[PDB]
């Protein structure tokens, strides 16, 4: 079979990959690395008016996650950005101009969900690139489907990316997994080739 | 022995489980998922008046963790809620009404502790369910002991949960592991069967 040394090697390398943001690819949409949401170019946030923050017994305001959370690595149930219905979009100014080669979308696992369902997850989606920051018409980079029966983190590689570069990318959600009120986005990542 | 494919399979599944909040069970006490502490129904917080926050050289206030931290997934030394002495309690409004089937309690590991001791950890505890939100007398669901010599995360399954459902649960700490001043609670989780 396998030697003990081979087992240690397999385990070490699997934990290395796990530690590298799970997938081992630089994320040009990570906010701490220099990416940001373009607030006016995102869907309206679905607000429930339920999470009330108070201080000294004084009600202050209701807390809802803004689109910024999709560019942050804190994926736990409820740490997601929600928009109303099954169609929505977010636009991100990447940390650098890149040739985009892949995107990653993740959702919470079924095992951490009541009744093992994730109907608020995005389903069909499309990625668009915008040449400059204030331009109206994007270029389609690819169309993909987040599989509710797949792994929580799903990476999608473009079949044949052109040589075009972009610093502005749109995540366009076309359908969801059936939730009748909203769609929840946990984390979106963009991968590719920077200047060198 | 085992094949290389079998090793990869074992490793993959262990990392899957690790990624699912370590234990692969939905947590109805997680604050981001919709749970909250009932502040007036918790022990007084032990305050040390040591962690002083300042701005522009102006002392502002002392920082202590409130009971909310036991419903958050950020377990590192000192990220715990403390009450005075070895007896205390916290009451949580769960995110949904459930038939409770298990609870999880975790503490920091001995390996991350000075002198390899965790004397502030809870020891004997009891779980109570409350039928409605403002009701005086809880129903005992079970009594358990957090083992200081066990794994940091310990899940306890009720032997024979009734069909009763609850949205309010009390964690009642009866003893600690010997700390003479306080008991520290890092994270408490509640698992069970929601409506479907």
């Amino acid at each position: 079979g396998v030697t003990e040394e081979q087992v240690h090697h397999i385990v070490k390398q699997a934990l290395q990959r796990y530690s590298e943001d799970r997938i081992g690819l630089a994320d040009y949409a990570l906010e701490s690395g220099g990416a940001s949401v373009i607030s006016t170019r995102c869907s309206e946030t679905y607000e429930t008016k339920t999470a009330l923050l108070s201080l000294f017994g004084i009600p202050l305001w209701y807390h809802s996650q803004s689109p910024r959370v999709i560019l942050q690595p804190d994926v736990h149930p409820g740490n997601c950005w929600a928009f109303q219905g099954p169609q929505g979009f977010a636009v991100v100014r990447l940390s650098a101009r890149i040739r985009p080669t892949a995107v990653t979308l993740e959702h919470v696992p079924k095992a951490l969900s009541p009744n093992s369902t994730i109907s608020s997850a995005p389903k069909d989606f499309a990625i668009f690139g915008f040449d400059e920051d204030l331009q109206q018409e994007g270029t389609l980079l690819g169309k993909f489907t987040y599989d509710q029966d797949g792994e929580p983190i799903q990476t999608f590689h473009f079949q044949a990316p052109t040589m075009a570069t972009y610093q502005v990318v749109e995540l366009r959600i076309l359908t969801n997994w059936g939730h009748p009120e909203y769609t929840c986005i946990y984390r979106f990542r963009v991968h590719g080739e920077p200047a060198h | 022995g085992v094949t290389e494919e079998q090793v990869h399979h074992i490793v993959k599944q262990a990392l899957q489980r690790y990624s699912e909040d370590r234990i692969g069970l939905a947590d109805y006490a997680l604050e981001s998922g919709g749970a909250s502490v009932i502040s007036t129904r918790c022990s007084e917080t032990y305050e040390t008046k040591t962690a002083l926050l300042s701005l522009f050289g102006i002392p502002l206030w002392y920082h202590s963790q409130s009971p909310r931290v036991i419903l958050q997934p950020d377990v590192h030394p000192g990220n715990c809620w403390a009450f005075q002495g070895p007896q205390g309690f916290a009451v949580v409004r769960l995110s949904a009404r459930i038939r409770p089937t298990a609870v999880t309690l975790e503490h920091v590991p001995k390996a991350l502790s000075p002198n390899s001791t965790i004397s502030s950890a809870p020891k004997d505890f009891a779980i109570f369910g409350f039928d409605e939100d403002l009701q005086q007398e809880g129903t005992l669901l079970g009594k358990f002991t957090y083992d200081q010599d066990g794994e940091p995360i310990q899940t306890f399954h009720f032997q024979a949960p009734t069909m009763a459902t609850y949205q309010v649960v009390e964690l009642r700490i009866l003893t600690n592991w010997g700390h003479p001043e306080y008991t520290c609670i890092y994270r408490f989780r509640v698992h069970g069967e929601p409506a479907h």
Binding site: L52, G78, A82, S120, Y182, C184 | -
Partner: peptide
């Protein structure tokens, strides 16, 4: 002054998940 604590209560059901 007194140690402040931001309290979070859910008053209108579940947040989006």
């Amino acid at each position: 002054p007194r140690t402040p604590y931001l309290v979070l209560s859910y008053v209108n059901g579940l947040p989006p998940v």
